[PDB]
Design a protein around this ligand. Sequence first.
Ligand SMILES: NC(=O)CC[C@H](N)C(=O)O
Ligand SMILES: NC(=O)CC[C@H](N)C(=O)O
Ligand SMILES: NC(=O)CC[C@H](N)C(=O)O
Ligand SMILES: [Cl-]
Ligand SMILES: [Cl-]
Ligand SMILES: [Cl-]
Lengths: 192, 193, 193, 268, 268, 270
Amino acid sequence: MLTIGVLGLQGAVREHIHAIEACGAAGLVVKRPEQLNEVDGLILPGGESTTMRRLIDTYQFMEPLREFAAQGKPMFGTCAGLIILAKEIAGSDNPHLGLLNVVVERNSFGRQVDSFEADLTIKGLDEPFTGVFIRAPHILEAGENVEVLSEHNGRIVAAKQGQFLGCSFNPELTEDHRVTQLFVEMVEEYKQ
Amino acid sequence: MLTIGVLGLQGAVREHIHAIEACGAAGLVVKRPEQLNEVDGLILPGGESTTMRRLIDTYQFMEPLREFAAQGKPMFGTCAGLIILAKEIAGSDNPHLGLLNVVVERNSFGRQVDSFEADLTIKGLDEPFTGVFIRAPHILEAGENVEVLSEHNGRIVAAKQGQFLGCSFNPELTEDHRVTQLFVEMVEEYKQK
Amino acid sequence: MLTIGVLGLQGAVREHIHAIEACGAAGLVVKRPEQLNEVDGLILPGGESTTMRRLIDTYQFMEPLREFAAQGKPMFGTCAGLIILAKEIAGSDNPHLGLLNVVVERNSFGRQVDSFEADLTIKGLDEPFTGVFIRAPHILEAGENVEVLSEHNGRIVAAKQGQFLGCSFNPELTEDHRVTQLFVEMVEEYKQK
Amino acid sequence: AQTGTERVKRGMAEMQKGGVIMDVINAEQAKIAEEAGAVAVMALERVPADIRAAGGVARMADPTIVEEVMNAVSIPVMAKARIGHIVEARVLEAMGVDYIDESEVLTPADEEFHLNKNEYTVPFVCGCRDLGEATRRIAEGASMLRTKGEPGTGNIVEAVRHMRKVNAQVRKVVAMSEDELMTEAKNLGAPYELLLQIKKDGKLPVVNFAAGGVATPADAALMMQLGADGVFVGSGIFKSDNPAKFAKAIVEATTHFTDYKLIAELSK
Amino acid sequence: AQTGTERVKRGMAEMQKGGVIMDVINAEQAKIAEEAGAVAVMALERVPADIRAAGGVARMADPTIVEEVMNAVSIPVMAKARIGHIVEARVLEAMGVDYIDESEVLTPADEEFHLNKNEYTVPFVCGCRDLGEATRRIAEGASMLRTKGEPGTGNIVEAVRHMRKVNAQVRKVVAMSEDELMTEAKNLGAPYELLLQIKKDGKLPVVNFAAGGVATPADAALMMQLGADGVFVGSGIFKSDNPAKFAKAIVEATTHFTDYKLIAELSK
Amino acid sequence: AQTGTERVKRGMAEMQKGGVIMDVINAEQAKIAEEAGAVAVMALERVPADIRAAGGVARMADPTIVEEVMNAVSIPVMAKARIGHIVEARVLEAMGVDYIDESEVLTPADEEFHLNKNEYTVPFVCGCRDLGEATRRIAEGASMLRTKGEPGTGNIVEAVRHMRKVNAQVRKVVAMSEDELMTEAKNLGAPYELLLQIKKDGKLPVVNFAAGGVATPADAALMMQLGADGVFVGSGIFKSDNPAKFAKAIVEATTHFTDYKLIAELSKEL
Ligand SMILES: NC(=O)CC[C@H](N)C(=O)O
Ligand SMILES: NC(=O)CC[C@H](N)C(=O)O
Ligand SMILES: NC(=O)CC[C@H](N)C(=O)O
Ligand SMILES: [Cl-]
Ligand SMILES: [Cl-]
Ligand SMILES: [Cl-]
């Protein structure tokens, strides 16, 4: 029985839990760092990256999250989470966990009126995935250790680096659980 | 998994389905003879034996039930069910299935006002089990092939004969599922041979 | 026929009177010093030791109570009452009656949220007794003239010293009168003497 | 051995589930009922709807009649007491009636207080229209319930109303937030602990039959489809051209309440 | 060991009997109350009637004030939570407040549902005006009751009215015929089992204090004379010329509530 | 790519869950909200309450102020339109506001007809007091709900009432017999298909925040405990002696709504 945590400080936490359970794993809402010890992987959900950072700081999550990665436990960031995961945020000198080797630009499609759906070809998925892009960032560049899993209008929107998986869209806003399923498999991998 | 049917023509059917599932088997309410094929064993529940015989007649259940027994499948009769199973019923020349080698006297303790609970010691159970006797019959006699599992004031109240389990009380009226567990175990062992 | 008083200035007075009567003594609620002359023994009930001391002072009960004790009349303190009886109170230079040779610490389990029930083994009781500990103190130490009757997790919670009985729990909050009976016997023994 | 326990009282009703209880006025009717597969008979001296529409006082049946019925059949025999009529109830109990219906279709003896059913050994069935009324009967000691329905019309509408109401209210209680239940109890006029136990059990603690307007096989099956645990049916059975056959059909429709081809044939 | 048991929660109230609980706003007042012989203090931020006089919202006290009071005295400390405000109650519990007053004189947070006090470890006192309301608070988990009385007037009349009403209703329930108790329960809006237990015990199962209106030593004694288990008194003690002296007089009147010569001196 | 889909509109609301939305009147307040961890700000010109207290007409904010707030923060920016005011709403949309509150606290422009929110690309939040009202707003195209509460009082009671009513009615709908749903629908004044889908989904189809009366950390936590998806909080924050610290306290209490020790500490000196 795999157990995958979802950082539950803020955002679309429940959508991720449902998706985890649809794939046959157990889901845990992580609100305290101590709870990271109870999970085999972690999803950083969509929401507001600024809110998450602030709550992460206040509750001293950053080091435990770094420890968590150091143990090789996989981490999956969707949009806000991708942002939390990124090495660098364009126009900011204050990045977050800094674990995924991508440069990210926040809010790069504009504002909510510009939020959109688009069908994506994703590496490891056969048939197209509907990406739901809610005040999404983009991935300006990705290091040579980063596997590109998806592009949209010539932009990287899904990437993988060892134990780290990141996408700029929110797969958990759909009932197509295949992107979560890719994370489940990375987590299985780690557990051996 | 085990599927144990409960004959659902009339009576305390769900109490039995609840006990079956409590023991980790699946229950099937049986309303049609064809459903007997879908189960490894059958409980004949508490209720009115007259009502159930009437419905058994009309829906042509008697031979299918005999067939069911012929195939070796365990059968469990609680009170009305015991009456349906019994070889002979005192005062009647019209017995029912007739597979359990006992003679039963219906309504032996009187009427509902006489219905009672008593603690029983039952062969195969450790602590005592609370027997709830609702307008219960009494087993007047049991043959040589019948094992006595329980007695109350000298009366045979629970009996076992090969694939057949019979009792004069209604264990399914309690949250103590240990007698149903005994029957589950009979079904499991049938399911091996 | 015995008469046991209960100091009636404040607290769970009725509870103690009920228990006295259940053991077959007569209970008298004591609100005036002169009433001490009318009883064979006295119970200092649970409540607020602060309140009881203030009222004891105001109605000049301290000397009467000391004379009562000087006469050999037995005295039983339960929680607040134990505090009134104690020779020393941790962190205070203003002790109360001071007749029982213990040092007591008030409010040592925390606050009401910490109040608890625990089964106690009490000397001279056969079966265990449910101690109901309401913002209870503990007995930090007891002198050599003091008999330890009970402890809870290695702390003294009941004690006897000749005519003095004291505990940190409130037995009068239960329907088990056996600790009250211990005290009744103490008074019956003084009433032969 | 203990007699008269709650479990024994209620257990009798649990053993009645899925059957039909038929009103009868003599041994002949009782024998027909039993032969048709009735799980019990309700012994009546005369039909109370006829007495009260006459417009006389409807009382306990002559014990001679109750005894005739008891001697004619091997199934349980129920009988009616007037609401609050302690002695009629104690008499029925001393006669060995298997279940007493503390019945609103008899002329009530006490318009303010129902029987303290808790103090009896024999169990009681009472009528209700809603969950508040149901829980008040249960708290007084009823061991079985039935819909009040609408006696003496053959209109299924009130049976339907009452069964639906009770069931709906139970579903709501089971699903509702626990801290909202005191307000619900107060609104319903339900004893609180009973309603809280409903939420924990997921169900009423006693069985609940349909009664007071079942006229056809389809009506019987309908009540079962709406969640009744069984059906009381009236003297109408015996006014038909073939009582035996009518009684049979009602029993079969109650048992096989989803078999519409079967029920179609029975409806002729 | 087990904490939070019914017997433990009520036990704490039993140990308060025959005493005076005083409203205090700071540690200086709290000390005077303890030294006067108070059995507990009720920590307040501001006087709630005044906040609402000024039309504002009266909420739980700043935990800073409650702490200052807790650290100033060795007697129990109570505090108030708005009706239905789950988190205010949980916060006070977390702070180790000894008794929570789910109080109508603060601005109700939930106008339809009171707290499910059964699920807490800390005990609660609630207000009531009659036995129906009393028994509903108890069923929700109240471990202690008080009169609502009439806050902010100094008019003893409503405390008198509520104490007398509850007490009269209890005497009638205790004396009445048991088979008439369901109708009584229904009329009162009382949970039936509680009412039956009241009849069997010959009393309310919880302590019942007087509150709202005690302004003089005669008033405090009066309330004890009418059957109160104790007295809550407000901030007016500290509006007096000699708060210490006034506080002591209330405590002494409450203790020696039939000593009229004494009460005469205390009333000067 | 497709913009303006129901999923995209509602998706934005889903991404706000567990958070606090703060009313703000300028750029500086916006920045403070964002730094406290607010998930969005609601740009106001003046506080609606005391426009109407002063008897005046409360309208859409001066777009200048809205733009000011939008440029000050990187979190979503909401703004209010009067009920039924088609053009105010279309102007807010053209400005790029992220969510429009068709708000009963502004002076209604249409007292009989709400906006046909279905026809817009930008999503809308609307107030409700019960499930019928909630489902009428959804059917008109609302992508998010909030309790009406009781604006400008600091009394949490009406927010509690509304959240409890909506949540109780949903539980009943989910549990009730399907064949009784039409009578329920008619009683509630709910569109039937929406009620049927609530039963099937086991939930309301849009997020539902608490609003109008959250004055303390305990209030915020309480609304969450009663099932709110998040909290709107008003300008009171910025009347505090330490607005930054107050705003932080509401964010933490909303987030950690069962941490009673924390909330105790958060509740001090406010
Ligand atoms: N869908 C989302 O997670 C939105 C992310 C948010 N706009 C940010 O910049 O962090
Ligand atoms: N409990 C029961 O099953 C009762 C049996 C019924 N008295 C009969 O003789 O058929
Ligand atoms: N149970 C009691 O008597 C309480 C005693 C009280 N806490 C005191 O210290 O005086
Ligand atoms: Cl009624
Ligand atoms: Cl009330
Ligand atoms: Cl409307």
